[PDB]
Amino acid sequence: LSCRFYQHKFPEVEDVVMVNVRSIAEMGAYVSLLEYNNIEGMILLSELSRRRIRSINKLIRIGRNECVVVIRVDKEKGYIDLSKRRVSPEEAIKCEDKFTKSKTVYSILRHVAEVLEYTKDEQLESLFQRTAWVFDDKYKRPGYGAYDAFKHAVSDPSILDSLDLNEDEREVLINNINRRLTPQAVKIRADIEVACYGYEGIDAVKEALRAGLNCSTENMPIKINLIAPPRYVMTTTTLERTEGLSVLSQAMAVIKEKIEEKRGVFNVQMEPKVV
Amino acid sequence: PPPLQAVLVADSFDRRFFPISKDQPRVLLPLANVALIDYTLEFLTATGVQETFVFCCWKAAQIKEHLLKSKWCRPTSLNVVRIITSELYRSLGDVLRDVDAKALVRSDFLLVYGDVISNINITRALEEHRLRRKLEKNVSVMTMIFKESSPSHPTRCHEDNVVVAVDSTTNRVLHFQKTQGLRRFAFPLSLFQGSSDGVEVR
Amino acid sequence: QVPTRKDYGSKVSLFSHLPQYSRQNSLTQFMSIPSSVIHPAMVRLGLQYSQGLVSGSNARCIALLRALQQVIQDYTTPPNEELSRDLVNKLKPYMSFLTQCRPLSASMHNAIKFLNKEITSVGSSKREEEAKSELRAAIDRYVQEKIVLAAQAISRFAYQKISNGDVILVYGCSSLVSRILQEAWTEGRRFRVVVVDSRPWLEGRHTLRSLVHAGVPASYLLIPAASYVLPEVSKVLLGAHALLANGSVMSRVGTAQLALVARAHNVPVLVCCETYKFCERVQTDAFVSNELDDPDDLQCKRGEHVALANWQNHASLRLLNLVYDVTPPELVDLVITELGMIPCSSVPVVLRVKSS
Amino acid sequence: QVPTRKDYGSKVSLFSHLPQYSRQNSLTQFMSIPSSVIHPAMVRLGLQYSQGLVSGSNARCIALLRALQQVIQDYTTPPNEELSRDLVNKLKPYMSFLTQCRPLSASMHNAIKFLNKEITSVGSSKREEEAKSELRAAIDRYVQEKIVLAAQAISRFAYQKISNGDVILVYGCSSLVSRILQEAWTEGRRFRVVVVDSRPWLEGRHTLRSLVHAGVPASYLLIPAASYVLPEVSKVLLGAHALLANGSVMSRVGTAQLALVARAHNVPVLVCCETYKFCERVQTDAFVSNELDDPDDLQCKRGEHVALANWQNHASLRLLNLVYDVTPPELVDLVITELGMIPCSSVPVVLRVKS
Amino acid sequence: GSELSERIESFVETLKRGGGPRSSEEMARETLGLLRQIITDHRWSNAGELMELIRREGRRMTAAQPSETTVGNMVRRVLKIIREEYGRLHGRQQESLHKLLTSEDFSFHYAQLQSNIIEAINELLVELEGTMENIAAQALEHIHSNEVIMTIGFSRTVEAFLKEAARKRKFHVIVAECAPFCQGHEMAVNLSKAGIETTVMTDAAIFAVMSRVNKVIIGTKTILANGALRAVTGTHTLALAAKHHSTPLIVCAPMFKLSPQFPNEEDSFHKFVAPEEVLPFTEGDILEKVSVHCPVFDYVPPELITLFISNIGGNAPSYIYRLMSELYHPDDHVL
C-alpha cells in the first residue's frame, strides 16, 4: 500500500531528491527514492565529496536519509545516477521542507484510504490521482500546491467540494484535514511587577492594569491576574504567536507608560514567551 | 522556581585580625595570592547562584573598588552582584533585617560569609530543602551545610568546634552547641520525647 | 543454485568460526554436468583448487586470472542492462563458489579487487567488443607487471645481499625464492642453501629439486631440527603469502618459528614479496583469520600401524591442519620488493603510493 | 561433626577449585554455644580469623600459637593412651576447622608443622605436666627466635642498604617493613617513604599512620599511579608472605605488579622475609593456589549509587578479588633474612640448612 | 554576535569548571559547531585574519582545560581545513625531502572561500556520526571463539566493540576497575546485561591475571605524535604486563583523539584532582604531614602498543606520524 508523492514516476535531470541508503556496492551506494515509490538509485563513488575520499563508509552511514541531486536518468534500464558534491545547503533545506509537507499530504491521503478500507493499491492510486495531482497541476508546482491547497481547504471546504471521489470519501477527507492540519493554539505569558507608593496607590495600579488590558485585540483577551502582591501575570491563549508576542510587548509598554505617568514604579520580571 | 539568590556578608562583625585588619579588611586578605572574596564568589557562581548581594561595612570602599575590577562585575558574568553599603551595620542580624526591610529575596536564598573557601555543589541539598518545604508546608526554615570530618584535623579549631544532636531519619537538627572550653557536653531530655525512634549525637 | 559445502569432522573450539572441509567431498556432485549457474571454467578452477592441483599463491592468482579472462570472453551483455554492473553481479557468485571450493588467498583477493575496479571504470557508451578486449589487455598487463617484472626486479635487488661463501636458509616452496637463488647462482655467486620442510605438504622437496637441477649445493631437513643448523646459517630468506598493513607477515605455518629461532641465533631475516600481495587489513594472530585444511592429511604411517587412522571415534580427540601463520614485524629485518629494499614497517607506505 | 561452610556466590571458571566464602556467614550458627567438639580458644580464633580481626601473617601465626598453647594447657591425656600421637590426632580437627574459617597462610603452616614435629618428639617416659611445660616453652622460644630476633637481625641488615636522601617505596602493610623503616630513622638515617595502597583492604593506611607517628616523611597514593612515582623512587622495599623453593615470592596481590613496574624503571627491589616463612612448595602462577575473599567487598559507592549492588542478579557477571600473587625470582634483587642479604635463588639453600 | 560570545563563555566555563559534554564525541561536535558559528557569525577579510581569530579562540579554549585535547584537535583540524581550502582555491606539502629538492601568504580574499570551508566542516561532522559504528563494524575480525579479553576502566568505543562482537561469538571479558573512580563496574554490568560473561576485579590483579589473557583491548584519551597514549591510570602497568606476556594490546580509538603534541609537556600531562578520592578527609591529623597525589592520566610509550583500530581501519603505531601529517599542519602545532 504505497504510491508516488508526485505525478511523475521518474525524476527529471537536476532534481533534488530525498533518498534512503540500503546497501553499498562497488559503483557506489544503493538507495530508494522515498517519494518515487522506493525505486532504487545510485550515489556514485566519484561524486561523494569535492575533496579526496578514502572509503565509502566515511560519509554514507547506511540507514540514513540523505538529500541528493540527480544527474543521469535512464528509465528503460531503471538506472538513476545521483550526486552529493553538487547540492547546496539552501537546496537541502528546501528539499527537506518540500519532502516533509509532501509526506504529510501522503499520510493524510493514506489515512483516508485506510479508513475507507481499500485493499488494492490501484484504488489508493486513483484516490491520490483525483485529489492531489489536480491541484498540483492547477498550481503548476508539485508538492507545494497540494499542501497549500489542503491548508486553505482546512478552513473553507469549498475547494474540497470540487473533488469527484464520493460523498463518504469527501467527508472522510474533510474530517482528516480538519483534525490533522488545524492545530491553532498558542499561549503567550509574561510577568510584570508594577506598583505605585502614592496617594492613590491601589487606584493607580488598577488604572494601569485596566489600560494595559484595554489594548487586547479581537480573539485575544489578555487575562491579567495577580501572581504575588507586587507582581501580576499576563496570560492569553491566542494563535499566531508571532503576533501574540508583539501584542504582549505592546500591552506591557502601555502598562509601563501608564504606571510611570501615575508617579509609580514598574519592572518586567519576565519577557513574553510561549508556554 | 525563581533563580537562586545569595546574601554574601562581606564584613565579619568581630575583630579576630588585629592589627592586620586595621588597614585591610579580612575579606581582602590574600590566601594563595587570591583574596577570600574571590574564592567565595567563585563558590557561589559555580553552584548556580545567579544573583548575589554583598553587605560590606568596615572599609567598604576598598571592597567596592576591588569588586568593581573583578571578574564577577563584568557584563558577561552570570552571577549578578549587587553592592550595598551601610555604616550602621553591627551584626549579621542587622544585615538580615535590612534584607527583609528592602525585600531583597523572594524564596530560598543562600547565607554565607565573605571568607568561605569551598567547592560544594548544593543542588542536592537545595532539592531536598525544597521538597521538604513543599511537603511540610513551610515548617523547615533553614538547611545548614556540614562536612564530615575528624576532631583531630587541623581545620577543626577549638574555637569553632560544634556538637549537634539530630534526628537521623529526617536530618533534622534537634540541638546545637559549641564546645569551646567544655570538657563535658550536656543534652536536654526534651530531645528524646518527640523523636524517640532515632536520635544521633555528632 | 549452488549448495553449501558440508563441514568435515569436528573442529577445535578456538577455530570453530572457520570452515573445515575434506578433499574427498566435492561440490560438483550436486551441479548439472553442462554447468549453467557456474561457468565451466570456474567449475574446473574450483575443482582444481579443492583437489590441490594449484597450490602456490602466484599460481593460484594466474589460474584465477586465466579462468576469469575466459569468463569475460564468453560473457555476453543481457539486453536492457549495463556491462559495468552486470559483469560484477555475475562474477560475485563465481567468487562465492571459488571460496566454497577453497578459501581465497591475498593475491586472489587483490586481483579480484583490481578487476572490479577495472570493470567499474568501463565506460557505458563504448562497444562491448572494445570493453572485452580492454579487460583482457588489462588482465594481461596486470599479470606481466605484477609477477614477471616484479620477480626480475626482486632478483636483481636480492643479488646484492647474497655474497660468496655464505649459507642461506629457505623454507617451504615459493617461486620467488627459487628464482632469486637460481639467478644469483647463474650470475656467479657461490653459496650453499639449506632447505627446511614441514609436514604434511612437504613442499620443500619442490625447491630442493629445483636447486639440485640448477646445480646449487643444497641441504634438506625438517623444521624441528632447524635450531641445529642455524649456527652455520648466515641468512634466512623467506617468501610471504601476504604483507599486512601493520607489517606482520602472513605465510606458511612454520615460517614464524624460523624467524624466532633466527633471532635466537643472531641471523638476519629477509622476506621477499611482490607489492600486489600487500594487504590493507591487519591481524595479530593466526586465530582470527586462517584456513583449516583436511585433518585426515595429518595421518602418517609409522611402521605397520597408523595411530590416527579412525580418529573420528574418539569423541574428545581433535585434529587441526593450519595453513598460515602471522609473523610480528619485529622478527623481520628486510622486505625485498620491486620498489626496493625496505624495512618491515614500510608496508603501509607502499600501500599509500600504489593507490594514488 | 563440624558442618562444611557453604560457598557464596558464583566463582570464576578458572578459580572453580578454590573456596569462596562470605564474611557474614559463620560456622558457629551450627555449633553448640559451650564448645565441645573443638576447644573454645580455637573457635574464638576461627571467628576472629573469618571476620578479619587478625590480618597480618606474623599476627596470624602468633595468635595461632597462643591459641595452641591455651589448648595444650587444658589438654588431658585419656587413659591407655599416649600423648605423642593422641595430641596430634586431637589437633587435626582444630586445623580443619581453622582452614574452614579461613585458608591457612604459610607462616601458620610452618608453625603447625613445627609443633607437630615437637609433639611427636615427646618421649613416652615423659610425665604429663613436664611434657606440657616443655611444649609451652618450645612454642614461646619458637615465637621469640623466629619473629622478634629475626626482625631485629633483618632491621640491622637493612640499615646498610638505606642511605641518606633516598626514596623508598613500600606496599601494603607489613610489620617487618615498618620496623625496618622506624629503626633506620631512629639510628640517624634521613629519607622519604612512599606508601602504595590498593582496594579493597586499603591496609597501607596502617603503615602510613605508623610512619607519621614515627616522624618519617611519607607520601600516599594508590597502586595504579605507582608508575608515576617510580621515576623519583630509589629503592622498592617489599614484605613477603612466603618464599617458595624456586625463589618465587608469594605476597599481596599488587606485589609482582609493583616489581615489574619497578624493573621497567630500573629501580632495585629488596624483599624482607623471615626464614620461617620459607616453603618447600613451588607454584608458577596465582591460579593453582590462592584464596578468594568476599566478592561483596568489591562494591564501592561512587557518587550516590553502587554499581555492583545486586551483582548476583546478572547471571553472567562474576566478581573476583584475589588475596595473593606470585613474583618470579627474576624480578627480585635482594632477600633480606636473619641469615643476611641473599640472592633470590638461595631460598632452597636456607631450606637445606634449616633442617 | 552577543549570543556567540555567550556560548563561548559558557563553553570555556564548562570546560574549566567540571565535566560537559559527557562523551568525547559530543565534545568534538560542540567544538566544531562553535568553530562553525565563529566562522559564520564574524567578519574577516583575509584568510590569515580568520586563522588568527581561530588561533585566539583555540588558545583560550585549550587554556581552559589542557587535559581535554579534543578541543585543540578540532581547532587544529579547522585550521588545516582553512589552509587546504585557501591553497586549493588560490594556487594549486608536509616538508618532505622531495619539496626541499624541488623548492606562505594568506592575503587575497576570495569570495568562494568561506562557504567551501563550511562545507568541509559539515563533512567532518558527518564522519563524527558514524565513527563509533565504523570502529565497531570491524570487531568480528579481531575476536575469535572462546577468547579472553581484558579491559581497563570504562570506554564507550570498547563497549560498542565488544557488544557488536558478542552478537555472533562467545568470549570472556575481564574488567579491572580504575581506582579511585571505579568506572569499570559500570562497563562490567553493561557487558553482563548483554550476556558477555564478564568478570570484575581490582586493577591490582592485572599482572596475576595477564598470564591467562589472550588479548587486551583498551580505549584512550589522547594519541600523541609518536604513537604514545595518554590513558587512564593503570594503563601503563597494563601495557607493561601485556608486553611481558607478549599478549597483543589493541587500542580502539577514533581519529579525533590524535594530538600533534609530543610528550615533552610532562608538567600538564596528567590531571591532578582532589586527594579526597585516594585518602578521605576523615583521616584526621595525619593529613597535615602526608602528601597525597591523585593523577587520573598516565603516559604509555608507543613500543607497548600492538595495533590501533580507528574508523579508517587498522594501523601500527609506527604509522601514526603519517596520519597526523594528513590531519594537521606543522605550523599549527603550537597554535
Author numbering:
A (entry chain N): 3 to 277
B (entry chain J): 40 to 241
C (entry chain G): 166 to 521
D (entry chain H): 166 to 520
E (entry chain C): 8 to 99, 105 to 115, 120 to 351
The authors write:
Various stressors such as viral infection lead to the suppression of cap-dependent translation and the activation of the integrated stress response (ISR), since the stress-induced phosphorylated eukaryotic translation initiation factor 2 [eIF2(αP)] tightly binds to eIF2B to prevent it from exchanging guanine nucleotide molecules on its substrate, unphosphorylated eIF2. Here, our cryo-electron microscopy (cryo-EM) analysis reveals that SFSV NSs binds to the α-subunit of eIF2B in a competitive manner with eIF2(αP).
We also analyzed the mixture of human eIF2B, unphosphorylated eIF2, and SFSV NSs, and obtained the cryo-EM structures of the eIF2B•SFSV NSs•unphosphorylated eIF2 ternary complex. There are no notable structural differences in eIF2B or SFSV NSs between these two ternary complexes. These structures revealed that SFSV NSs and the unphosphorylated eIF2 can bind to eIF2B simultaneously and there is no direct interaction between them. The conformation of eIF2 is essentially the same as that in the eIF2B•unphosphorylated eIF2 complex structures and the switch 1 region in the nucleotide-binding eIF2γ subunit is widely open as well. Therefore, it seems to be trapped in the nucleotide-free state.
